[PDB]
Design a protein around this ligand. Structure first.
Ligand SMILES: CC(C)[N@+]1(C)[C@@H]2CC[C@H]1C[C@@H](OC(=O)[C@@H](CO)c1ccccc1)C2
Ligand code: NA
Length: 528
């Protein structure tokens, strides 16, 4: 018996086949870039105030003084959820009385907006918040939709695995790509809020599912050395490109339906890949469909120009491949021994906190100062050097000090936010981008570090548990942004404190660099 990576080693590590597969599977990750964080523009809240119908016979003075003024940022602004009793105002205006001259505005009665709201159109022409008035007593519905999107992503994480195992990688990939694109398109025709919410849940489910299927198919087709590069840089950078191009679209298109059309179109464009990506030969061998694997291997050999006679490859060996011992599935293994128990708890908390920080910072961009589109672009762009640095650090430096430093930077920088004087408000944006830089580096590194910490017997299970923890964290991530209304800096204080505690935690994990990866739990490294 032999190994699949050995039997197939004759194809080489790099060449026309593996190159095309690498850049096509990576290109299929772009739509997840602008689909993941489109909520920053689809669910944005413009400035708004109570609407006063023009039927009111109010003087120009009264029309200038129809809403109480409240102070924000040290500056007067119309109160966004309350107005002076329109009937009392109309009675005063009919009597000839005028504000200030005859009326003390400070003691008038107030009511909520019974004629709806007037949203400004300086930035957004329309969004779902303006469509269904998700403001004042409905404001909690705005982040809820985003939480529900990540809820769908959670469910997709469970389902896409089993589906891909039972029906293949390419089939699940393209089916869920089409599902995501179709439900993204359908959302344009949402009559009311509930249909939009449920369609957004399904869109997130499809998005996660097809990301996962692309990742698994790529890490199964590519060779041993290029596998790491694909997993680490290949998909991350093209996700960053998708995110970076999201604000480019949102700048020209400022209507949520036309923006959904624009973000839907690339998904339809990706369907051409069906004729270029083959099914994973390793999976087909797992199902016992050896003729299809043989055909795909011979086609790859022909594409790379390698002569493949019986002396260098034969299906008889293909039919007698080795199978690795099956890994434990019962979760009890992760809790049976004290050391692995503690390592699992720390990894859960580390992944959840890194995810909360990353998605909170991503979703908080429209609340920063300066141009919203420039801020979103800078947020998307600061990830590419974060991935390059993460990759170099993983290649050459111990994981513990690297991740302690990246988290310490990401957390400490945020705590400085409250110390920036308003005159130099732009420094706060600098800090926030450096903050997200650190978080992004840590987020890229943990995917590898955790996979090294667990022994083979349960490695996948442990990684999956920690990954689910991170995904749970992003359900909470839009609510930390929601807290920005109660107190501007509270979200950053929370994120910074939690990140510093996570950076302190990381130092207690055992070091893996430069040591053989363990095979059985008895060989697992001990926590400090
Ligand atoms: C930060 C880098 C390493 N990622 C490529 C990792 C973690 C975040 C980012 C994107 C990806 O994680 C996701 O969950 C993706 C695809 O499901 C996602 C992006 C945006 C919204 C929801 C999910 C995997
Ligand atoms: Na995709």
């Amino acid at each position: 018996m032999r190994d699949y990576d050995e039997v197939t080693a004759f194809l080489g590590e790099w060449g026309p086949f593996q190159r095309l597969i690498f850049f096509l599977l990576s290109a299929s990750i772009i739509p997840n870039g602008f689909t993941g964080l489109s909520s920053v523009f689809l669910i944005a809240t413009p400035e708004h105030r109570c609407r006063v119908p023009d039927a009111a016979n109010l003087s120009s003075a009264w029309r200038n003084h129809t809403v109480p003024l409240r102070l924000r940022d040290g500056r007067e602004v119309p109160h966004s959820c309350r107005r002076y009793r329109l009937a009392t105002i109309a009675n005063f205006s009919a009597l000839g009385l005028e504000p200030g001259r005859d009326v003390d505005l400070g003691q008038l009665e107030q009511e909520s907006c019974l004629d709806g709201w007037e949203f400004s159109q300086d930035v957004y022409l329309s969004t779902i918040v303006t469509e269904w008035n998700l403001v004042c007593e409905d404001d909690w519905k705005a982040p809820l939709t985003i939480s529900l999107f990540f809820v769908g992503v959670l469910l997709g994480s469970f389902i896409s695995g089993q589906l891909s195992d039972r029906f293949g990688r390419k089939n699940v990939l393209f089916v869920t790509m089409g599902m995501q694109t179709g439900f993204s398109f359908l959302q344009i025709f949402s009559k009311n809020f509930e249909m939009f919410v449920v369609l957004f849940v399904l869109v997130g489910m499809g998005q996660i599912s097809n990301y996962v299927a692309a990742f698994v198919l790529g890490t199964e087709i590519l060779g041993k050395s290029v596998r790491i590069i694909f997993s680490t840089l290949g998909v991350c950078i093209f996700y960053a490109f998708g995110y970076m191009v999201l604000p480019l679209f949102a700048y020209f298109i400022r209507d949520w339906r036309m923006l959904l059309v624009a973000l839907t179109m690339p998904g339809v464009l990706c369907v051409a890949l069906w004729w270029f990506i083959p099914e994973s030969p390793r999976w087909l061998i797992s199902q016992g469909r050896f003729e299809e694997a043989e055909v795909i291997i011979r086609k790859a050999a022909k594409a790379n120009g390698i002569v493949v006679p019986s002396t260098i490859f034969d299906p008889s060996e293909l039919q007698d491949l080795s199978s690795k011992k099956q890994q434990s599935h019962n979760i009890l293994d992760l809790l049976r021994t004290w050391n692995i128990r503690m390592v699992t708890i720390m990894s859960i908390m580390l992944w959840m906190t890194i995810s909360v920080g990353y998605f909170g910072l991503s979703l908080d961009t429209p609340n920063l100062h300066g141009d919203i589109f420039v801020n979103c672009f800078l947020s998307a762009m600061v990830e590419v050097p974060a991935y390059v640095l993460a990759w170099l650090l993983l290649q050459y430096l111990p994981r513990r000090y690297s991740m302690a430093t990246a988290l310490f930077l990401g957390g400490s920088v945020l705590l400085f936010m409250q110390l920036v004087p308003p005159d130099l408000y732009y420094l706060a944006t600098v800090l926030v981008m450096v903050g997200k830089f650190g978080v992004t580096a840590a987020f890229s590194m943990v995917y590898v570090y955790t996979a090294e910490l667990y022994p083979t017997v349960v490695r996948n299970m442990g990684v999956g548990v920690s990954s689910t923890a991170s995904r749970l964290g992003s359900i909470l991530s839009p609510y930390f942004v929601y807290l920005g209304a109660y107190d501007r800096f509270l979200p950053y204080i929370l994120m910074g404190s939690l990140t510093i505690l996570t950076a302190i935690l990381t130092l207690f994990l055992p070091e893996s660099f430069g040591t053989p990866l363990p095979d059985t739990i008895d060989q697992m490294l001990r926590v400090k």
